[PDB]
Scaffold this active site. Structure first.
Site, PDB file in Angstrom:
ATOM      1  N   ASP A  82      -0.895  80.595  40.744  1.00 40.33           N
ATOM      2  CA  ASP A  82      -1.428  80.681  42.105  1.00 40.33           C
ATOM      3  C   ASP A  82      -2.798  80.041  42.330  1.00 40.33           C
ATOM      4  O   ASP A  82      -2.950  79.207  43.223  1.00 40.33           O
ATOM      5  CB  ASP A  82      -1.478  82.150  42.556  1.00 40.33           C
ATOM      6  N   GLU A  84      -0.489  91.130  30.173  1.00 35.88           N
ATOM      7  CA  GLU A  84      -0.124  89.978  30.999  1.00 35.88           C
ATOM      8  C   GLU A  84      -0.866  88.708  30.581  1.00 35.88           C
ATOM      9  O   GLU A  84      -0.276  87.627  30.543  1.00 35.88           O
ATOM     10  CB  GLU A  84      -0.409  90.286  32.472  1.00 35.88           C
TER      11      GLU A  84
END
Ligand SMILES: *[C@@H]1O[C@H](CO)[C@@H](O[C@@H]2O[C@H](CO)[C@@H](O)[C@H](O)[C@H]2NC(C)=O)[C@H](O)[C@H]1NC(C)=O
Ligand SMILES: *[C@@H]1O[C@H](CO)[C@@H](O[C@@H]2O[C@H](CO)[C@@H](O)[C@H](O)[C@H]2NC(C)=O)[C@H](O)[C@H]1NC(C)=O
Length: 788
Positions: free
Chosen positions: A548, A751
Site C-alpha cells: 500500500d 506480520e
C-alpha cells in the site's frame, strides 16, 4: 472423469471434518456444508470471580493476551493437538482432535489442568452445538436422548446433508467444583456448579455465531433473578439454566465447572458417530490410541516431506528446529477454514480511472452467497481469505500436502462469476466475518485488482507436476497426468477469465512516451500491448499493488507505468503457458510463451534505468513533458523482476540486483531484506509498513530466485564464496535465526519485522506468509529430475 470423481470422493471424505471455524480458539463445522451443518465451539472462563464473564474466551483475539495458543501438531486430514495457556484464568487447556480412518466419525478430547494448583479458581468450560438447517429443510434436528448420570450425555441428530448421527459428551475424570460443607451448591433451580449443566433452545441459523453473547445474556438474566451469598457460591450463580423455560431446539449449551485447585485437572470426550458406521469411535481407550496413532502419523507425513540438518542457523538443536517447523506448519494448516455467506460489494458507484481521491462506496449491496475453503493470514487479526496472501500460503502448503493446495486454489477460482473475472482482495462472508472488520473496510470494490499470487503458486505447482509426469499419497495430482488434466480442464476457463480481466483493467497508456521512445530509438522494438499501470491508486496509497504505502510517482498520473504490475502480468502469463502445456493446447502455449517473452523484453527496454542500475516505475516529467523519468525507490518493487524470475538468465543486470540486495546501506540487514532502502526519502516515514520493515513473503521469493539464477548456491562446498552465495547464505541464516528468536522470545510469528533490531511487528500469530520459514529450514528437492 470417472477416475477424477473417485479421487475427488476420497479427497472430500478425508477433508470433511476438522476445526474449520478458525476464527474460534476451537470451533468446528464440516467442509462445504452450508445448509445443514453441525456447528460446534468451545468457550471457557474462571467462574470463581464475580466478573469471570469478562474473561470468557471464544474467538481468537490479540486482546485476550493469552500466554500461548495454537496447534503443536495438526493436519486437517487426520487431526491434531491444540494448546491454550491462559494465565488470567489459571487454565492449561489441551484439545485433541481425531477421526476414524474413513473420516466420517470424529472425537474431540478436552483436557485441562491448573497453571498454579494453589490459586483458588475454576475452569468453567462451555461447549455449544447447533444442528443448523431445520428452519429451511424441515428435517434437520438435534436432541438429547439420554444420559449416564449427571455428567454423561447422549444426543441424536439429523443433518439433511450428512445424515443421521450420534453425539456424546462424556467425562473421563475431573473434580467438579463444590464446597463439601454445604448441603448443596445450588443457589437457584438449575444454577448448580457441582454437576454438568445443559440447556437447549432454538437459535436462528444466522445467529449461531453469537453463542458467547447469548450465553452472557442468559446468565445475566439469571443473576438478575437471583439478586432480586458467600464467594464460593459464585460459580453456581454463573451456571446457565433454563430461566425462561425455553422449548428444546437446534442449539445446545453444555457447561462443566471444574475445581482448579485439584492438580490432576480434568478430561472429557466429545464423540460424533455417523449412524450405521462400520468404524464407530466407541470407547475412551479407543480415543486414546487414536490420538497416539494420529500424532505419530502426522509426524511421519512431516518427516516424509521435510528434512533438517545441523546449521547453518544457530538454533540449538535439530530436534528443536524440526519441532519449531512442525508447529509453524501446523498453525498455517490450523488457520484453514470453511466460510459461507454474503459479501458487501458496490458495483453501481461510477469508477473514474483518471482521478486519485479516495472513493466513497455509497451503493453497497449484499451479494452472494459465496463460499470459500482457504487458509488465513492470522486467526486473531485476519481470520478470512486474502487474495494476495493466499499465493504465499500455498507455496508452503504445497510442499506438505500437494493435493490440499489444489483444493484451496480451486475454491478461490470458484468465486469468479460469469460477467466478470474479478475476485475481491479480501473475502468477508456474513455477519460472523464482518464482526472482525471495521465498517469502513467491509465494502469491496470490483474495479480494484491485486497481485495474482495464486497464479504464482499455480505456476510453481504445475512446474513440479510437469517435471514429474514427463509427457502428456497426498500428491496424486503431481504424479497422475489423467487427474491433472481433468483438474486443468475444469479450472482453465476460470483462470482465462481472470487473466483477461486483469490485463484489460490494468492496461497502461503507451501512446504518450511515443515521441520520447522514438527519440531514444526503441519505440519500434517495444511491445505496445504489454505495458501496465496499477488502476485505483490514490495520492498517498496504492492498494492494488499489495504494498500500500510503498512510494510511488508524485504527483499521480494516468501515464504512469508500473514495473511490478508488468512483472505480475509476466507471472500470470507463465502459469497460462503451463496449463496450456498440460492441456496440449500447442498454439495457445506458444502464444503465452511469446507474451511472457514480450513482458521480459519490455522490463529491460522500458523499466530498466542504466543510470540508477535498477528496475523502475516510469512516468512523464510533470514539468518537461519531453522527458520520461524513472521513479526509482529502491526496495521490493525494484527486486520483483528478479524475485519473479523474469530477468534473462546470464543477464548483466543480475549482478546489479544482487548488489542491491547485498548492500547494508540499502536493503540488506541482519534480519532480512528491508522493504525500502535506508537511503530513500520515504524510509521510516508515516505508517511505516512497506517503507523499511522486513516481510517474509518477498524475502522468500528472492531466496527462491537466487537458486534459479545461481544454481551453485544450493551446494555447501568448502572454498571461496561467490557474491551470490554470500547473499543467499547470510539471508537464509538471518531470516531463520531472527524469526525463530522472535518466536522463542516474543511468542509467535509476526506480520513483519523491524529494521532496527529485528523485533516482531504488525499482526501476531501470522501464519500467514511468515510460515514460509518452514521451507527455508526444511524444503528438500521440490524439483523433480532423475535418480538413475
Ligand atoms: C466433491 O465435493 C464437492 C462438495 O462441494 C462437490 O463439488 C459442489 O457440488 C454440488 C453438487 O455436485 C454443485 O452444485 C456445486 O457446484 C459444487 N461446488 C464445487 C465448488 O465444486 C463434488 O461434487 C464432490 N465430488 C464427490 C465425488 O463427492
Ligand atoms: C501444559 O500442560 C502440559 C500437560 O501436562 C505440559 O506438557 C507434560 O509435561 C511434561 C514435562 O515436559 C512431559 O513429561 C509430558 O510429556 C507432558 N505431557 C504432554 C501431553 O505434553 C506442559 O508443560 C504445560 N505447559 C505449561 C506452560 O504449563
Amino acid at each position: 472423469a470417472e477416475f477424477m470423481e473417485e479421487y475427488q470422493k476420497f479427497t472430500n471424505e478425508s477433508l470433511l471434518w476438522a476445526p474449520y471455524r478458525s476464527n474460534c480458539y476451537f470451533g468446528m463445522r464440516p467442509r462445504y456444508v452450508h445448509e445443514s451443518p453441525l456447528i460446534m465451539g468451545i468457550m471457557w472462563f474462571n467462574s470463581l470471580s464475580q466478573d469471570g464473564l469478562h474473561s470468557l474466551r471464544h474467538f481468537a483475539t490479540p486482546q485476550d493476551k493469552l500466554q500461548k495458543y495454537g496447534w503443536e501438531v495438526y493436519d486437517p486430514r487426520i487431526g491434531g493437538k491444540e494448546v491454550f495457556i491462559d494465565e488470567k484464568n489459571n487454565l492449561n487447556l489441551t484439545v485433541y482432535f481425531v477421526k476414524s480412518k474413513n473420516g466420517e466419525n470424529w472425537s474431540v478430547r478436552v483436557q485441562g489442568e491448573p497453571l498454579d494448583p494453589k490459586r483458588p479458581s475454576t475452569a468453567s468450560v462451555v461447549l455449544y452445538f447447533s444442528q443448523n438447517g431445520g428452519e429451511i429443510d424441515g428435517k434437520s434436528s438435534l436432541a438429547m436422548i439420554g444420559h449416564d448420570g449427571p455428567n454423561d450425555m447422549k444426543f441424536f441428530g439429523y443433518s439433511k446433508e450428512l445424515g443421521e448421527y450420534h453425539l456424546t459428551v462424556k467425562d473421563n475424570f475431573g473434580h467438579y467444583f463444590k464446597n463439601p460443607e454445604y448441603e448443596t451448591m445450588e443457589v437457584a433451580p438449575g444454577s448448580d456448579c457441582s454437576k454438568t449443566s445443559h440447556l437447549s433452545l432454538q437459535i436462528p441459523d444466522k445467529e449461531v455465531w453469537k453463542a458467547r453473547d447469548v450465553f452472557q445474556s442468559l446468565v445475566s438474566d439469571s443473576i438478575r433473578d437471583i439478586l432480586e451469598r458467600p464467594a464460593d457460591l459464585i460459580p453456581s450463580v454463573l451456571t446457565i439454566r433454563n430461566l425462561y423455560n425455553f422449548n428444546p431446539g437446534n442449539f445446545h449449551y453444555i457447561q462443566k465447572t471444574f475445581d482448579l485447585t485439584k492438580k490432576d485437572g480434568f478430561q472429557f470426550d466429545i464423540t460424533y458417530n455417523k449412524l450405521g458406521t462400520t468404524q464407530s469411535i466407541s470407547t475412551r481407550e479407543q480415543v486414546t490410541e487414536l490420538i497416539t496413532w494420529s500424532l505419530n502419523e502426522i509426524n511421519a507425513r512431516f518427516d516424509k516431506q521435510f528434512s533438517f540438518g545441523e546449521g547453518p542457523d544457530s538454533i540449538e538443536s535439530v530436534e528443536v528446529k524440526r519441532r519449531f517447523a512442525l508447529e509453524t506448519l501446523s498453525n498455517l494448516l490450523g488457520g484453514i477454514g470453511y466460510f459461507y455467506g454474503n459479501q458487501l460489494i458496490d458495483r453501481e458507484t461510477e469508477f473514474d480511472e483518471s482521478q486519485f481521491t479516495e472513493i466513497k462506496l455509497l451503493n453497497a449491496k449484499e451479494e452472494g452467497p459465496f463460499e470459500l475453503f482457504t487458509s488465513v493470514p492470522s486467526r486473531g487479526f485476519f481470520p478470512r481469505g486474502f487474495y494476495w496472501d493466499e499465493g504465499f500460503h500455498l507455496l508452503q502448503i504445497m510442499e506438505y500436502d500437494f493435493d490440499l493446495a489444489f483444493e484451496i486454489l480451486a475454491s478461490w477460482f470458484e468465486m469468479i462469476e460469469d460477467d466478470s473475472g474479478w475476485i475481491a482482495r479480501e473475502i468477508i462472508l456474513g455477519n460472523e466475518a464482518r464482526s472482525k472488520v471495521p465498517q469502513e473496510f467491509q465494502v469491496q470494490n470490483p474495479n480494484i485488482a491485486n497481485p495474482p499470487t495464486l497464479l504464482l503458486a499455480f505456476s510453481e505447482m504445475l512446474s513440479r507436476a510437469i517435471e514429474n509426469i514427463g509427457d502428456f499419497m497426498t500428491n496424486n495430482l503431481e504424479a497422475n497426468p489423467g487427474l491433472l488434466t481433468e483438474y486443468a480442464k475444469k479450472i482453465y476457463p476460470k483462470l482465462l477469465k481472470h487473466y483477461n480481466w486483469f490485463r484489460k483493467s490494468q492496461t497502461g497508456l503507451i501512446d504518450e512516451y511515443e515521441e520520447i521512445l522514438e527519440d531514444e530509438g526503441i519505440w519500434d522494438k517495444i511491445h505496445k500491448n504489454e505495458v501496465y499501470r496499477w488502476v485505483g491508486r490514490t495520492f498517498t496509497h496504492c492498494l492494488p499493488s499489495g504494498m500500500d504505502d510503498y512510494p510511488r510517482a508524485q504527483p499521480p498520473d494516468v501515464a504512469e507505468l508500473n514495473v511490478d504490475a508488468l512483472a505480475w502480468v509476466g507471472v500470470m502469463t507463465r502459469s497460462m503457458k503451463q496449463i496450456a502445456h498440460v492441456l496440449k493446447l500447442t498454439q495457445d502455449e506458444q502464444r503465452y510463451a511469446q507474451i511472457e517473452q514480450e513482458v521480459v523484453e519490455n522490463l529491460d527496454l522500458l523499466h530498466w534505468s542504466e543510470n540508477d542500475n535498477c528496475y523502475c516505475d516510469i512516468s512523464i516529467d510533470p514539468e518537461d513533458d519531453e522527458i520520461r523519468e524513472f521513479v526509482c525507490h529502491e526496495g521490493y518493487v525494484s527486486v520483483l523482476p528478479f524475485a519473479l524470475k523474469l530477468i534473462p538468465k546470464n543477464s548483466p543486470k543480475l549482478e546489479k540486483v544482487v548488489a542491491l540486495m547485498s548492500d547494508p546501506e540499502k536493503i540488506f540487514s541482519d534480519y532480512g531484506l528491508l522493504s525500502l532502502s535506508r537511503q530513500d526519502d520515504y524510509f521510516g516515514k508515516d505508517e511505516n509498513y512497506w517503507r523499511g520493515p522486513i516481510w517474509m513473503n518477498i524475502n522468500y521469493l528472492c531466496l527462491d530466485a537466487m537458486r534459479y539464477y545461481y544454481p551453485e548456491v544450493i551446494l555447501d562446498v568448502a572454498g571461496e564464496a561467490s557474491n551470490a552465495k554470500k547473499l543467499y547464505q547470510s539471508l537464509k541464516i538471518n531470516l531463520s535465526n531472527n524469526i525463530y528468536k522472535v518466536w522463542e522470545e516474543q511468542g509467535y510469528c509476526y506480520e513483519n519485522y523491524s529494521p532496527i533490531d529485528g523485533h516482531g511487528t504488525g499482526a501476531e500469530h501470522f501464519t500467514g506468509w511468515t510460515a514460509l520459514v518452514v521451507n527455508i529450514l526444511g524444503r528438500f528437492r521440490s524439483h523433480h529430475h532423475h535418480h538413475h
